[PDB]
Ligand binder design. Structure first.
Ligand SMILES: [Cu+2]
Length: 105
């Protein structure tokens, strides 16, 4: 299954929509620019399983995404452990543009 997460609400609010997604192994999450880019996707290394910098860095798209509808996707293969993964947008972290992926299993 593929879960689409909009970056930016239709109104311009700096939010991921939906902010919380639950996935199963093999599922994909696809972030897509919606309103008021640029956005990016940074996983907090203290807020992924094992507090792994490697894992957080692997999942992140640190490069700013400027283009309308620009997309980034992660397929959660077996090298992604069960647990919750919290991420944020660096441009809008202060404003609370934060999200969470829960990997079940
Ligand atoms: Cu943002």
């Amino acid at each position: 299954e593929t879960f689409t997460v909009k970056m930016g609400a239709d109104s311009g609010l700096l939010q991921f929509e939906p902010a919380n997604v639950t996935v199963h192994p093999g599922d994909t999450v696809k972030w897509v620019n919606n309103k008021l880019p640029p956005h990016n996707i940074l996983f907090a290394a203290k807020q992924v399983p094992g507090a792994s910098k490697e894992l957080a860095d692997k999942l992140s798209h640190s490069q700013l995404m400027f283009s309308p509808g620009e997309s980034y996707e992660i397929t959660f293969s077996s090298d992604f452990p069960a647990g919750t993964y919290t991420y944020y947008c660096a441009p809008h972290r202060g404003a609370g543009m934060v999200g969470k992926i829960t990997v079940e299993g």
